[PDB]
Each structure stands twice: as structure tokens, then as C-alpha cells.
């Protein structure tokens, strides 16, 4: 004999909302159903009652916005119209003995949010203890996940424990004092063979999306193995100070517990082909040693590129970095400000601009970063990320949502950068281009079949004669628009006559064209008609009907 509520979620102002009270144990032909609400931080507030005959009565503030209906023998629905932010509350249904709401059987309530802060997805991090503080026989162990920084409620955390039993315990959420976002800690206590067991938390955030799932996988140790150390050595330049014609980089991975180990060299973060480097593993006693050698031209070394030795060992990543040496390294802060992409403007319909400030020297204090509009109208709240980089600098990113209609009518947005160590303030500004318009021509092509390229093909797309230069190119295949990383797209360059062009190149695999051989190149552009997109499909099969 209990009651449960369902249907509480985050919706916009003005959206209708239906909550469902499912009862168990008793009959609705004997008992009435009360509805009571409670916002976070106030007292209880009676909404309404439905009797056994179906008659509903509501409070004086309700004013016909509420309706209660008996839908089945176990379910009672509450329909709610004309929502504003004052109805953000936890909603209880109760088994009423009479028309009074004096009762001992209540449901736990469901939570309805009408809010105006940003819908933020949670960040999920593992909570494991320090392994030297964990005993040898510790026949049970307690671990967890922290899901923080989300808005609004709720998150749902379940656990995959493998073959063990695990008792799961999810704490009530805490409002973070600085941001207003929420944070939960969900804890899992298991027993038995926990030292070699993989543990998994599943955090679902239905206000972000219905299928927003974070599926975090971790073990319960931060020792694991004895930790390797990575260092990079290099060739000397000679006695006159001059570089040799090739440069050797020797990445040394010192003594570790033997296992599979995996080395990638990066040039400014991009993976080089494994043919340009060697690797060697030796074993002495119970301990392994690994070296990797990379060969570089003198020109590339003098071009000041940064190289990263990336070690992957038992699912854990180690790294080390290097660039061309210097006696002194001057650097100053620089800033860049983007326009919104056409895809974000016209497909996603949620444009943003980003002010990216790079190569600042990490001195004392935070960098002042302010958004403004020339019209004096208000800006939205922005997001700010600060990230230390491999080359030792700190890069700060600020992303500002902009109005779609605002952007289209020619508003100018300004990014203003101040810092105490700066000589003067740095200024960047952005606005819709005042040049003319011209629609893109689109042409998609497939390269022919020839030896050595049976199960991988290259597709290409030419987009040309458009004006202005800002354009988004994507590839779509079998009712999914494929990720940007799958393909490459050139930077806009001027055509000989009038307008710009870009090329895009996409390598595809046999399974994709056997799945569907129809591939669509799509351009999003402000001058495109009727809905700011133009697209063209190609089939790679292109059959050889000689003389038609």
C-alpha cells in the first residue's frame, strides 16, 4: 500500500505538463486522491482532490490551471497549464480517506523545474581512496562517483559491479554556492574480489537530454602497478653550436611492471605515422625498460614545433613534451574572436561566439575577460574555460551565446581583455560581413576504383562561387550527419572571378558504402536558399555505361 509520482521534469515556461500518481494496494473507488506541492525552501501547499466519483476541487489560487483525472484503476493524472517559474516544486500525491488531506500515506514526490539558468550536463569523476591507505585484507571496499556541476535536477546513478554484489547509496544533492549548479555523490560498497574488478557508474541527466548517459569505468586503485617514468633525451648540436642534419629524440620509459605498452609521437598534438619512428623493449629480471626513437629533419626542428611522447600502459596514459630549446623564450598574449558557424546559426539554431585568448604568461591572478555589445543591450552569461597547455602557457576560452535575430541584423560584439600585467586593454570585435551575397555551387565526386584501394575509397566535394566566405561543410550518410573529424575541409580562398571556394575530402571504408553507398555533401551558408542550406548527393558505384 503506497503511492508513487512520475512525470516531473524540466520544461520551458508555457509548456503543459502531466504528472502521474500510480497507487498500489488500495482501490480508487474507496479512497480519494490529494495533490500537494512544495517548492525548495517553502512550506507545503494544497493543490487539489479528486473523489471516487470523479469530482475535482482545487484551491483558490489554482484558477482552472489544474485538472485531475482518473485514467485507470491504479493511475491518477494531474494536468498543469500556463507554467511560470513559481511552480518549480516537488509534487506529492496522497491517499485521502475523506475530502480532508489528513493522511499517513504519501508518495515521495516528483520534481518540476521551470528555470532560467543554463541546462548544464554533469561532470562525472571517480572517487577512490589512496591505495596505501587501503588494507591488504579489506574484505569490502567503498568507492564512488561524484557527479557535479549540473543544472537542474535530477541525475540518476546506477552501478555495474560485474560478478560481485554491490550496495549502492545515493546522497541528496548539494547546491554549489558559487555557480548554483548541483552535485551528487553516489557510493558503491562491494566485497570479495574487488582488487581486480572493474567498476562502472551510469549517470543519467534527463534535463540535458533523455538519452544523456555518462558511463564512467574505473578500478579502485591508484597504485595499480609501480609507476613508470618518462623522459626524452635528444642529440647534441656540435662544438660550433650547429645542429646535425637529422635530430634524434629518444623517449625513455624507465622500470615498470611488465605489460603491453604503446607509444605515439605527436607534432603539436597530431599523430605521426608509426613508420617514421622505432621502438624497443627489453626485460631485465622482473623489470621492463622501453625506448622509442624518432628521427626528424633539421628544418622541422628549427621550425619550433612541439613534440609529445605518449605512453599508453594498461589503460593509463603517461606523457612528456618537448619543443626546440631556447636560452630565452619571450611570449605575449594574443586573442582571437570567431563568428558563429552557419551550422550553429541555421541548423542547430543556437549561435555562439568564442573569444580565445592564448599564449598568456601564467602570472599571478585571473585574466579579466568581458563581453559587450555596441548597442548597450544586455549580453547573455558566458562560459569560461582555463587550460594549461603542453608548451607551458595557459589558454582561456570564453564562449558567449548570441541571439540569432541579433546576429542577422548586424550587431557588433566586443571581447575586452584586461589584466594588471598588460600595458593596455586588448580589444577584439565581430559582426556579420557587410559584403554581398551569392549562393554556393556544390559538386560531389568519387574517385575511381584501382589496385590497392578495394575497401577504402576517397570522396571529394567542391563548394564554390559563394559569398560571403563563412560556410559550414558536413558529410551525411544513411540518416546521420557524420562527425567533422572523419573528413578534412580546406580554408576558403578567393576564386579567380567572384566568390570563394572550399574542397572537402572524406576517406570512407567498405562497410559504410555496403551499408549505404549514397553519401551527401552538405553546405550551410547564409546566402543559400530557401533555408540557408544546399546539399548534393553522390553514389560511388558510378557504373561504366560506355557509349551510354
Amino acid at each position: 500500500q503506497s503511492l508513487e509520482e512520475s512525470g516531473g521534469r524540466l520544461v520551458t515556461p508555457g509548456t503543459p505538463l502531466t504528472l502521474t500518481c500510480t497507487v498500489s494496494g488500495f482501490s480508487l473507488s474507496t479512497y480519494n486522491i490529494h495533490w500537494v506541492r512544495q517548492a525548495p525552501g517553502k512550506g507545503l501547499e494544497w493543490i487539489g482532490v479528486i473523489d471516487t466519483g470523479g469530482g475535482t476541487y482545487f484551491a483558490s489560487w489554482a484558477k482552472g490551471r489544474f485538472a485531475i483525472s482518473k485514467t485507470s484503476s491504479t493511475t491518477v493524472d494531474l494536468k498543469m497549464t500556463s507554467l511560470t517559474a513559481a511552480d518549480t516544486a516537488t509534487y506529492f500525491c496522497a491517499k485521502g480517506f475523506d475530502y480532508s488531506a489528513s493522511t499517513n500515506l504519501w508518495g515521495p514526490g516528483t520534481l518540476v523545474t521551470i528555470s532560467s539558468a543554463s541546462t548544464q550536463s554533469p561532470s562525472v569523476f571517480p572517487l577512490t581512496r589512496c591505495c596505501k591507505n587501503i588494507p591488504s585484507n579489506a574484505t569490502s571496499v567503498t568507492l564512488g562517483c561524484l557527479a557535479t556541476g549540473y543544472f537542474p535536477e535530477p541525475v540518476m546513478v546506477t552501478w555495474d559491479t560485474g560478478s560481485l554484489n554491490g550496495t549502492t547509496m545515493t546522497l541528496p544533492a548539494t547546491t554549489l554556492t558559487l555557480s548554483g549548479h548541483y552535485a551528487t555523490i553516489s557510493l558503491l560498497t562491494v566485497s570479495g574480489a574487488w582488487a581486480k574488478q572493474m567498476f562502472t557508474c551510469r549517470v543519467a541527466h534527463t534535463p540535458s537530454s533523455t538519452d544523456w548517459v555518462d558511463n564512467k569505468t574505473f578500478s579502485v586503485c591508484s597504485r595499480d602497478f609501480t609507476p613508470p617514468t618518462v623522459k626524452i633525451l635528444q642529440s647534441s648540436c656540435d662544438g660550433g653550436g650547429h645542429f646535425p642534419p637529422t635530430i634524434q629524440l629518444l623517449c625513455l620509459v624507465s622500470g615498470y611492471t611488465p605489460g603491453t605498452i604503446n607509444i605515439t609521437w605527436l607534432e603539436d598534438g597530431q599523430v605521426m605515422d608509426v613508420d617514421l619512428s622505432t621502438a624497443s623493449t627489453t626485460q631485465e629480471g622482473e623489470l621492463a625498460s622501453t625506448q622509442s626513437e624518432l628521427t626528424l629533419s633539421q628544418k622541422h626542428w628549427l621550425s619550433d614545433r612541439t613534440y609529445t611522447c605518449q605512453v599508453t600502459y594498461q589503460g593509463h596514459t603517461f606523457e612528456d613534451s618537448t619543443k626546440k630549446c631556447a636560452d630565452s623564450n619571450p611570449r605575449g598574449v594574443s586573442a582571437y574572436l570567431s563568428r558563429p558557424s552557419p551550422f550553429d546559426l541555421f541548423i542547430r539554431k543556437s549561435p555562439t561566439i568564442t573569444c580565445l585568448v592564448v599564449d598568456l604568461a601564467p602570472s599571478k591572478g585571473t585574466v579579466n575577460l568581458t563581453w559587450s555589445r555596441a548597442s548597450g543591450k544586455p549580453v547573455n552569461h558566458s562560459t569560461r574555460k582555463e587550460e594549461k597547455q603542453r608548451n607551458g602557457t595557459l589558454t582561456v576560452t570564453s564562449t558567449l551565446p548570441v541571439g540569432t535575430r541579433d546576429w542577422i541584423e548586424g550587431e557588433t560584439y566586443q571581447c575586452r581583455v584586461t589584466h594588471p600585467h598588460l600595458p593596455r586593454a586588448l580589444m577584439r570585435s565581430t559582426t556579420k560581413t557587410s559584403g554581398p551575397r551569392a549562393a554556393p555551387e556544390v559538386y560531389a565526386f568519387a574517385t575511381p576504383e584501382w589496385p590497392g584501394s578495394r575497401d577504402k575509397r576517397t570522396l571529394a566535394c567542391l563548394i564554390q562561387n559563394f559569398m560571403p566566405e563563412d560556410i559550414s561543410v558536413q558529410w551525411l550518410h544513411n540518416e546521420v550527419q557524420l562527425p567533422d573529424a572523419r573528413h578534412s575541409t580546406t580554408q576558403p580562398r578567393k576564386t579567380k572571378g567572384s566568390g570563394f571556394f572550399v574542397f572537402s575530402r572524406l576517406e570512407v571504408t567498405r562497410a559504410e558504402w555496403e551499408q549505404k553507398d549514397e553519401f551527401i555533401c552538405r553546405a550551410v551558408h547564409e546566402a543559400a536558399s530557401p533555408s540557408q542550406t544546399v546539399q548534393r548527393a553522390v553514389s560511388s558505384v558510378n557504373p561504366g555505361k560506355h557509349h551510354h
Binding site: 494544497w46 571517480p126 577512490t128 591507505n133 561524484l146 547509496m169 546522497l171 554556492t177 552535485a183
Partner: protein, 217 residues
């Protein structure tokens, strides 16, 4: 139109003391007697203590006593215990099928013993890439709920950068669980070495401390 005034909004009394919560109505309730008294904690539905203004509900203890008639009603709670850490409400039913709640009234109180299991969690390396460090102190399967958590960062007592979450009472062993999250920046995290959680509790004769140092574990 009609009002219920619940007075006072806050009241404090120790163990062995009593509280009196009054509800005054602008119009007399249905049959001069239709009023309920509810007990509600954090994250819970309210639990019925009194229905029909003097009659004790099933499962409520005998120390909850309702009285009153007409417009004037009083809940008296004698012989105080820690399960009375709640907001208390009154509900009046009226002619015209009208149910109105009272304003609410808060009391604090303690009672029995069971010691906490303390655990400390360092921030993950995935969180340190984001510029934030959260250090987690867990107090497990304890009672009283009245426990004090102090954060020590290189033996300096923290203030204003920690938040606690306190669970409901468990339906099996009737205990509580707590966590305190200490939130620091990554630059403030890596400037310090020793991170300690000190837990003071009445089942503990001395405040127990669980600590780690950064990067050595």
C-alpha cells in the same frame, strides 16, 4: 481569502523540554475539529502525527499531543528526541472542501549513540584537468546526525569552501550518512600537501582524523 497563522516560525528547546506550536484560523474549521499536524524532514513526504486535532495517528509516539477547537489549535511536543528535527505543519479542512496548510515551525535536538566510519577521497586526475579539485570526506553509518566535519589544508582550518550532504534515516538500521566536499581550485590544490578531514562525534571520545598527502598514494 481565509488565513492560518502558524506561530512561531522557529522554536528551540532541549531534551526533556517541550515545544508549543499554535495555529490560529480566520474562520472555524469543518465540524470545529478538522485539523491535522504533520512532521516533515528534508527530502521526505510529511508524516501524519495528529489528525482530527487531538487524535494520535498510528505509528506516532504518545509524546505528540494535539489540542484546541474552533479557530485555536495547539500542538505540544514534550519529552524531546532527535527524530523531532523537522518542520511541523498544520492542515485545516473547511466548508467548501477547502484544505489549507500552516506556515511551518522548526526545532533542533539529539539523542542516542553509534560511531562513524570515516573515509577520505582525493580528487581524480580527470577533475584536475578541468581546473577544480574536490576532496570528499565520508561519514558512514553513524548516529547522531549531529557530527562536525573540519577541513585542514596544511594544518590550516578551512572556512567557506566545503559543503555537506546528509542522507535520510535508513529504513533498516536507522542510521545516517554524511559527506563533506571541499572545493578548491587546481592552483590552490597543488600549492599544498596535507589534506585532512577531522570528524567530531559523540560516539567518538576523540575527534578522528583521516588524511592524505598530494601525489604520494
Amino acid at each position: 481569502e481565509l488565513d492560518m497563522t502558524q506561530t512561531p516560525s522557529s522554536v528551540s528547546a532541549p531534551v526533556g523540554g517541550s515545544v508549543t506550536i499554535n495555529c490560529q484560523s480566520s474562520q472555524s474549521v469543518y465540524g470545529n475539529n478538522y485539523l491535522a499536524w504533520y512532521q516533515q524532514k528534508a527530502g521526505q513526504p510529511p508524516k501524519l502525527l495528529i489528525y482530527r486535532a487531538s487524535t494520535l495517528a498510528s505509528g506516532a509516539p504518545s509524546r505528540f499531543k494535539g489540542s484546541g477547537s474552533g479557530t485555536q489549535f495547539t500542538l505540544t511536543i514534550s519529552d524531546l528526541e532527535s527524530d523531532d528535527a523537522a518542520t511541523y505543519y498544520c492542515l485545516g479542512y473547511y466548508n467548501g472542501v477547502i484544505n489549507v496548510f500552516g506556515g511551518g515551525t522548526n526545532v533542533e535536538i539529539k539523542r542516542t549513540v553509534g560511531a562513524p566510519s570515516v573515509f577520505i577521497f582525493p580528487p581524480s586526475d580527470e577533475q584536475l584537468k578541468s581546473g577544480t579539485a574536490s576532496v570528499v570526506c565520508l561519514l558512514n553509518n553513524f548516529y547522531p546526525r549531529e557530527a562536525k566535519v573540519q577541513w585542514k589544508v596544511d594544518n590550516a582550518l578551512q572556512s567557506g569552501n566545503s559543503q555537506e550532504s546528509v542522507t535520510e534515516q535508513d529504513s533498516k538500521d536507522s542510521t545516517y550518512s554524511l559527506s563533506s566536499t571541499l572545493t578548491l581550485s587546481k592552483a590552490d590544490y597543488e600549492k599544498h600537501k596535507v589534506y585532512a578531514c577531522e570528524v567530531t562525534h559523540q560516539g567518538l571520545s576523540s575527534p578522528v582524523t583521516k588524511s592524505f598527502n598530494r601525489g604520494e598514494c
